[PDB]
Amino acid sequence: HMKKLLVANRGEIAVRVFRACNELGLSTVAVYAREDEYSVHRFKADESYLIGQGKKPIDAYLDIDDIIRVALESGADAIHPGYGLLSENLE
């Protein structure tokens, strides 16, 4: 019932969850900011989408609505937050 996963993080943890999902067989969706356009995790996913346009990159990764919109428009089923950013955020 779960066939696609989104990672709302960046850096090492995003590639770690990408490797875990590819081992499990799920598809991967990445999110990145304009200042994070050269990160490794952007090109390690099946599809990548830019979030938080015109904002601070840390605030771009904390944009709950943009991540939700990307996950909805990408057909993602699950969202893995990783560590930090919105990992411990209840909202």
Binding site: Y38, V40, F43, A45, D46, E47, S74
Partner: protein, 585 residues
């Protein structure tokens, strides 16, 4: 980057702004595509006749850039405005976006499959009817093909999203169009039988094509299962009073709706369309104002404002039309090397009657040889050759025969008497030989008997439909041959494209294996390559966007291979490309 685009000259990549996106006031309404989809083609025909206002056909996507940019408009530029055209312009009857010279030219130069363009435009335009210029016995080519090949092509085109089929003939011959019309009828789409207009109907000095000839031609086209009668004026010869008389006499004769297609070459296209609207025409072919005028069709905004206060209006939303025209004006500047030049209303077209695309092709061919300054006597030779052939209809591929014959006659310094008497032993180009051998078909009134015997010496001359005299094509054997030639299983569209263009499809597949899908690049990057320290984003797939930045261009070595230092996806990648100008080892 290191060798330049073929054909055009090497120039620096100019910086272009992001084209002006439209600001549309969307008005949801039922279009002709829905009426075709749930009800049928006859309901579409009934809806056309029940509309008081004149319907419009957008010829921007094929004919406007055929007559101006030489069919070089790429799919990437249509993709940014196809959704806007489909949404903000729902009153359009159909959009001409396929067929004609686009099928050959895209494969030959643009290195993109026209089937891929059709699929993409069907995805982005779900509520707009699509139209292809079918050419009778030929479909997109210039040589005859068997009937099963044409029927398979029609089936695949109707499956992939073509809704309107405009079928004409180069010599206005009904045997070359009846099979195509019947196939389109069997496939459940709209068949547009087309009368190729030529000459003047109000001039008694040219009585070969009078009003009665067009009347009986429309009668025997109405005898077939044609949905909409079409009048194609390829050279812009339709005078406004002649247009009124022709449309009135055709409406008094048959009951099919009339579709008028004409060019603004003489500058009298708008008044011709208005006169046809007064006479009771149903659909007219109009392009957007950025790609209108001159060689192309009259503008849709100009024809709206010409009929704004008249008894009959034009069904369009002109604010959205100007908003789309903003984007078309912005993206026209990408095709600066492909512009013909300064345009002007040429009233000389009433004499030589060249089609505009054939006019530009003949001008380029004459410039390719040492006869670029002899274009006036080339035009005179064209008119005299058309007269000496017996006043045949000049449209492709029959206009190509006249152009090649005039070029051959003026290149070797020939004369009408010299060809008529001395040229029995003289060679001839294969287009004229094939035309006089009956490959194109039977002209109205028959060939000149003596000149035919002079032109073709002893080769076989047929007098029937050339489709019967063609070798049959087995789809299984050619499918297996295409499969082993390209290394993977082809579809029906790939097979039917390989049948018509054998070498061109193989060259397209070779460039597909070499360079990949180059249709996803923007036009300045497609044409002029890349600049120093220039960053581009290429969307090869939804969610996959390549980040390409060029850092350095290395010096050519002794072997002649430059090294280009790229930054693909943030990581350094060095690409070795052979410079073609060093010519050294």
């Amino acid at each position: 980057t290191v060798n330049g685009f073929p054909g055009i000259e090497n120039t620096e990549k100019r910086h272009f702004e992001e084209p002006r996106q439209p600001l549309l006031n969307l008005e949801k309404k039922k279009t002709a595509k829905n009426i075709l989809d749930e009800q049928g083609a006859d309901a579409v025909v009934d809806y056309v006749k029940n509309t008081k206002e004149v319907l419009l056909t957008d010829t921007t996507l094929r004919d406007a850039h055929q007559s101006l940019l030489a069919t070089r408009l790429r799919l990437q530029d249509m993709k940014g405005i196809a959704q806007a055209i489909d949404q903000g312009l729902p009153e359009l009857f159909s959009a001409e976006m396929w067929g004609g010279a686009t099928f050959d030219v895209a494969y030959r130069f643009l290195n993109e499959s026209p089937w891929y363009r059709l699929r993409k435009l069907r995805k982005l335009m779900p509520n707009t009817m699509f139209q292809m210029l079918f050419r009778g016995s030929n479909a997109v080519g210039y040589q005859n093909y068997p009937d099963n090949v044409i029927e398979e092509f029609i089936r695949v085109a109707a499956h992939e999203g073509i809704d309107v089929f405009r079928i004409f003939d180069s010599l206005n011959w009904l045997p070359q169009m009846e099979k195509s019309i019947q196939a389109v009828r069997d496939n459940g789409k709209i068949a547009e039988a087309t009368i190729c207009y030529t000459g003047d109907i109000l001039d008694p000095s040219r009585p070969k094509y009078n009003i009665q000839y067009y009347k009986d031609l429309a009668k025997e086209l109405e005898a077939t299962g044609a949905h909409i009668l079409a009048v194609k004026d390829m050279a812009g010869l339709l005078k406004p009073q002649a247009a009124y008389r022709l449309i009135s006499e055709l409406k008094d004769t048959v009951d099919l709706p009339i579709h008028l297609h004409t060019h603004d070459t003489s500058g009298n296209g708008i008044i011709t369309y208005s006169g046809a609207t007064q006479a009771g025409v149903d659909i007219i072919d109009v392009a957007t104002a950025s790609l209108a005028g001159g060689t192309s069709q009259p503008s849709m905004q100009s024809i709206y404002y010409a009929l704004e206060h008249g008894p009959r209006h034009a069904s369009i939303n002109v604010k959205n039309a100007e908003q789309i025209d903003h984007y078309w004006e912005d993206v026209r500047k990408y095709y600066a090397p492909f512009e013909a030049g300064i345009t002007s209303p040429q009233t000389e077209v009433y004499m030589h009657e060249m089609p505009g695309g054939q006019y530009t092709n003949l001008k380029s061919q004459a410039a390719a040889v040492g006869l670029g300054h002899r274009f006036d006597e080339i035009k005179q030779m064209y008119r005299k050759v058309n007269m000496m052939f017996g006043d045949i209809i000049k449209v492709t591929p029959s206009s190509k025969v006249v152009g090649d014959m005039a070029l051959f006659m003026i290149q070797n310094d020939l004369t009408e008497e010299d060809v008529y008497a001395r040229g029995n032993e003289l060679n001839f180009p294969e287009s004229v030989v094939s035309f006089f051998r009956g490959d194109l078909g039977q002209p109205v009134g028959g060939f000149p008997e003596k000149l035919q015997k002079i032109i073709v010496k002893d080769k076989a001359v047929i007098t029937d439909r050339p489709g019967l005299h063609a070798e049959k094509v087995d789809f299984e054997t050619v499918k297996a041959d295409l499969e082993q030639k390209i290394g993977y299983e082809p579809g029906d569209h790939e097979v039917i494209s390989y049948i018509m263009y054998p070498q061109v499809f193989l060259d397209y597949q070779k460039m597909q294996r070499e360079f990949g899908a180059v249709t996803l690049l923007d036009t300045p990057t497609f044409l002029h390559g890349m600049r120093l320290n220039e960053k581009i984003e290429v969307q090869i797939e939804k969610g996959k966007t390549l980040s390409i930045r060029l850092d350095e261009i290395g010096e050519p070595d002794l072997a002649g291979n430059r090294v280009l230092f790229f930054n693909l996806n943030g990581q350094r990648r060095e690409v070795v490309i052979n410079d073609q100008s060093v010519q050294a080892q």
